[PDB]
Scaffold this active site. Sequence first.
Site, PDB file in Angstrom:
ATOM      1  N   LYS A 184     -15.429   2.239   3.063  1.00  0.00           N
ATOM      2  CA  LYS A 184     -14.267   3.101   3.310  1.00  0.00           C
ATOM      3  C   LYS A 184     -14.251   4.344   2.413  1.00  0.00           C
ATOM      4  CE  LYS A 184      -9.208   3.015   3.189  1.00  0.00           C
ATOM      5  NZ  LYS A 184      -9.158   3.637   1.856  1.00  0.00           N
ATOM      6  N   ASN A 242       0.824  -1.208   0.000  1.00  0.00           N
ATOM      7  CA  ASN A 242       0.000   0.000   0.000  1.00  0.00           C
ATOM      8  C   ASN A 242       0.860   1.261   0.000  1.00  0.00           C
ATOM      9  OD1 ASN A 242      -3.090   0.528   0.379  1.00  0.00           O
ATOM     10  ND2 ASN A 242      -1.987   2.153   1.508  1.00  0.00           N
ATOM     11  N   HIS A 244      -5.773   2.250   4.988  1.00  0.00           N
ATOM     12  CA  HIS A 244      -4.999   1.059   4.686  1.00  0.00           C
ATOM     13  C   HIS A 244      -3.705   0.976   5.493  1.00  0.00           C
ATOM     14  CE1 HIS A 244      -7.360   0.393   0.750  1.00  0.00           C
ATOM     15  NE2 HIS A 244      -8.019  -0.040   1.823  1.00  0.00           N
ATOM     16  N   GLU A 275      -5.680  21.340  10.200  1.00  0.00           N
ATOM     17  CA  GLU A 275      -6.221  20.228   9.435  1.00  0.00           C
ATOM     18  C   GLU A 275      -7.116  20.717   8.298  1.00  0.00           C
ATOM     19  OE1 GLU A 275      -8.250  17.825  12.357  1.00  0.00           O
ATOM     20  OE2 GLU A 275      -6.343  17.015  13.253  1.00  0.00           O
ATOM     21  N   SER A 287       0.123   5.386   0.620  1.00  0.00           N
ATOM     22  CA  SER A 287      -0.879   6.328   1.098  1.00  0.00           C
ATOM     23  C   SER A 287      -0.221   7.556   1.708  1.00  0.00           C
ATOM     24  CB  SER A 287      -1.848   5.692   2.047  1.00  0.00           C
ATOM     25  OG  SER A 287      -1.156   5.249   3.212  1.00  0.00           O
ATOM     26  N   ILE A 288      -0.966   8.635   1.736  1.00  0.00           N
ATOM     27  CA  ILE A 288      -0.591   9.819   2.478  1.00  0.00           C
ATOM     28  C   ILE A 288      -1.312   9.761   3.814  1.00  0.00           C
ATOM     29  CG2 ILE A 288      -0.524  12.313   2.545  1.00  0.00           C
ATOM     30  CD1 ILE A 288      -0.749  12.421  -0.425  1.00  0.00           C
ATOM     31  N   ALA A 289      -0.504   9.895   4.873  1.00  0.00           N
ATOM     32  CA  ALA A 289      -0.945  10.114   6.261  1.00  0.00           C
ATOM     33  C   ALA A 289       0.082  11.037   6.881  1.00  0.00           C
ATOM     34  CB  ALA A 289      -1.029   8.856   7.067  1.00  0.00           C
ATOM     35  N   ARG A 290      -0.352  11.992   7.693  1.00  0.00           N
ATOM     36  CA  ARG A 290       0.540  12.984   8.253  1.00  0.00           C
ATOM     37  C   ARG A 290       1.515  12.348   9.240  1.00  0.00           C
ATOM     38  NH1 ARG A 290      -4.123  15.757  12.144  1.00  0.00           N
ATOM     39  NH2 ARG A 290      -3.310  14.909  14.094  1.00  0.00           N
TER      40      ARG A 290
END
Lengths: 501, 501
Positions: B388, B165, B188, B279, B167-170
């Site tokens: 999701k 996977n 994910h 945010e 993905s962007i997550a901070r």
Amino acid sequence: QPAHLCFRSFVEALKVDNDLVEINTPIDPNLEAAAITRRVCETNDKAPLFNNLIGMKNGLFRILGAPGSLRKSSADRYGRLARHLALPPTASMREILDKMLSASDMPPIPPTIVPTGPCKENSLDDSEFDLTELPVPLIHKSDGGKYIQTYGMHIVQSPDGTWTNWSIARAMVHDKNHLTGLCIPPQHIWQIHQMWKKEGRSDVPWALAFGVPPAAIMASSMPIPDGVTEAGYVGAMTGSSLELVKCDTNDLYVPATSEIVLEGTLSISETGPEGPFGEMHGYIFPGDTHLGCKYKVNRITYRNNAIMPMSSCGRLTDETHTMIGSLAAAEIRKLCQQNDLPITDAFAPFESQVTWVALRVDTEKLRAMKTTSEGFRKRVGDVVFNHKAGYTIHRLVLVGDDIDVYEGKDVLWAFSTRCRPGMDETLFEDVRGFPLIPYMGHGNGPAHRGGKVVSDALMPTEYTTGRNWEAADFNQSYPEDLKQKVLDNWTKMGFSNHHHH
Amino acid sequence: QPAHLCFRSFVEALKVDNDLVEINTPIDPNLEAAAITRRVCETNDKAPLFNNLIGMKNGLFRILGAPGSLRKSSADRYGRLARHLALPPTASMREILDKMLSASDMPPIPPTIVPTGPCKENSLDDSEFDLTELPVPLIHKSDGGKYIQTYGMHIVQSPDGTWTNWSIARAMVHDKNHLTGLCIPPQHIWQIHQMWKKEGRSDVPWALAFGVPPAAIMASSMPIPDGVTEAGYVGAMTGSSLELVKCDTNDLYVPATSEIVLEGTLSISETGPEGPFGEMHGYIFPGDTHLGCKYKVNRITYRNNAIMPMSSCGRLTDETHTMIGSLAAAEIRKLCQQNDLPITDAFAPFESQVTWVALRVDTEKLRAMKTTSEGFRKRVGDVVFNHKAGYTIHRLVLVGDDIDVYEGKDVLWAFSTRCRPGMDETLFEDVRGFPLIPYMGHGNGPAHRGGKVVSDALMPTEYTTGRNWEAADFNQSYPEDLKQKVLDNWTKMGFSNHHHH
Ligand SMILES: Cc1cc2c3c(c1C)C(C)(C)CC=[N+]3c1c([nH]c(=O)[nH]c1=O)N2C[C@H](O)[C@H](O)[C@H](O)COP(=O)(O)O
Ligand SMILES: Cc1cc2c3c(c1C)C(C)(C)CC=[N+]3c1c([nH]c(=O)[nH]c1=O)N2C[C@H](O)[C@H](O)[C@H](O)COP(=O)(O)O
Ligand SMILES: [K+]
Ligand SMILES: [K+]
Ligand SMILES: [K+]
Ligand SMILES: [K+]
Ligand SMILES: [Mn+2]
Ligand SMILES: [Mn+2]
């Protein structure tokens, strides 16, 4: 005479403002004038003055479209409204609404009767006019009639003579000497019409004056209280007694400088087909005709070179948004304050098609009330939705002190981010609804009841200890010295920038 | 290498587009870079490239702000997004989202392993870097850390190796060799982290690659299905196998042209303080720190003159709106169609702070379903809010074929005029909620559950016999020949008018 007190002077003011386009070539009142006007309203262009209207007979009539619509610039966005009120063209919405509310705590200034005026320059009796022969516009292609009446004021008086009401309600030509129009509860034309119907003795003496003093048409569009004579409220607001002349065929009084005056009766017994009409929420339902109130016209008087103002209403932005919405919001603000609610400001966002009103709350005062969202929402909605001032408004959005309710973007931001759907809202099903909104009169439920909501976009700590966030924006997420440095170096670094534009 | 496949090439493309400002004088990563970027985002200006960042050590690093934000013109509004995907800069949102969905009915194109690439030009081992010494930005004044990770992609693989996977997550710097960040359900990164926690044997092999192929960062931001390896989806979308190199300290694979790569582990046992952060909904709650997932960094590799992309997120408009909202809307559109719902188009209006999605309905197909609003609303909400792809979206607005869902004004019009509050809506309290929305995580109810609604802005006859209105607008309330005459004579008459601008 000053622009706010004389429609002819107001037209001159718009010219001089470079806020008028005079169209001196022939324009068809069948759709063409209203199409140009519609385009103006959708693009915030200059107001059109149609000086050459195909079928103009005996000086009747020129048309001014978009009299209360928006200007393109942000700096004088509301200038056409300011010109109704003797305000600078750069006036804010807050300043315009405060002006409109100023007479609410002043003694009325009753009107002054004068023996004649420009509205008596010409006359046509029952044998000399035919309303089907006048260049009355067809405003939208599917309208059910030619809507002569979009920006004049109906004048009716209580049977006992104590209350004379001025209001805008639509009307269309029925035949050579009658109109039909809307007279629906809880509007004052309806309330007075009810009084005459209960007395049961005669039809209601009536006049309809077009091209009235701009300050008077503003009050005509505002839900000032029951029993209050608009003439005296306008007098107080302007600081000047309005000059009125008597009608020739009845004892009502019309503004001396009215462009066009119809005199006659509003029937207590007869109705006729009315509508459909392209309406403020942006719709027409073809073929949707209903019985409306019926007016008989006995006499027309008018100025030389008379000018008929016209609203080509529908989608954003026209008089139905700028005046119906904003002036209801003004009255609602006051109503809330008079009920001891901590409301500082109110506005009907254009983005809501003026079906919402955003209420800015003094949260210091809220905190002192030691209340909750469910309680406060109910209290606010009971005050507003049980009152005539709340009639047209289906959603109230409560917002704290950081939101400028006159800025739709900021209202939408607060609504979308601070009001949890369902839980933070209270639905009101046992209040009067506004049937003209499509989801009411053409919707799934009762046309005339319910469909109202209070949406609380106050955050929880606004009721308790105070706001507990900072915005993630340039204004609030960076210290002052840094922000100023960035602004000072902006064009130097290579980025792009004027207030007037 | 093409712009869509190589971040360095993408930066060149923006320059050549006149969509870049290179700032070669010293800029402070403490707030100044993010303040400039914030201003850019609020004004749709050119993207800033900070070539001289105070504290840049050993080639680490330059910053590009606003990589996926809006341009000022309507004609190339979405051009920066189009440049992620090899699309013309004039591409519509519909075209961008169709491009992002195109791989959903194509065989994956697995990546190609190559022995080296630019991301190996420089390396720093555990004894040679200190993440607290790098010019990591402070993005908002009240942030709880220096957010190194706003526009890189985390790379994690299932224990069984079958799903990798992106993905962007901070994530923010914790100490010299650790980050903390968000790893929340149903994302994910969280789902894979759960798999490793249940196996219980080791920390999760991890990499975080910054300045990855623009087409890869777009997929990183999209909720493509569970179990689908983003590399192969990007490969299919672009028609080209992506070139990857192996990490030095683990067996994961990173884009060959990545600007900066962190290699290490995501702990299955340890947490650390994370947040607060300014945010996507436009807020920060000072002092609101919670425990987040914790990453250990073992190695940094990087290009010569490495460039760190950064999102200075908050109020409109930035990557969190243009990418999170639009790409969720895209997935939702497809999800609805795969569930046999007659949805043609979906978009998350910016005006809703991308918390709404407007769903355009094929009303011919709806009529054939012979259903009702209450039934259809429930069906749509069950499909979307139990999946999701619907996670971030709290309100669905159903609209008929006349509405362009990519135009917020028109969505707001339909919502405000066609959806009766309460009666035309269905609330969903037993679905997963998005806690980041203030009215959820800082609201009156459960942070993680409910607060969702389907608002039906279909009118009643759209379910039965067909639309029964015409708009009261210039387009629909006047015949074609008249409209064209008005447009042709517009400037002649004296009114005001270019598409590019
Ligand atoms: C500015 C404005 C206001 C209209 C109006 C229009 C405009 C241009 C039209 C003519 C273009 C479209 C229809 N209008 C109607 C209307 N109110 C009503 O009861 N029937 C109407 O047909 N209003 C609103 C009405 O004037 C306000 O509700 C007043 O408060 C009524 O005055 P009252 O409080 O004295 O009853
Ligand atoms: C474009 C973008 C997407 C962010 C994001 C940001 C940006 C710029 C930030 C970094 C500036 C602010 C925070 N982000 C988070 C995030 N999702 C998440 O779970 N945690 C986050 O912290 N997202 C959304 C996330 O990337 C999408 O939900 C993906 O669908 C996740 O990929 P997945 O489907 O493979 O889990
Ligand atoms: K009135
Ligand atoms: K709330
Ligand atoms: K993804
Ligand atoms: K509906
Ligand atoms: Mn009144
Ligand atoms: Mn994924």
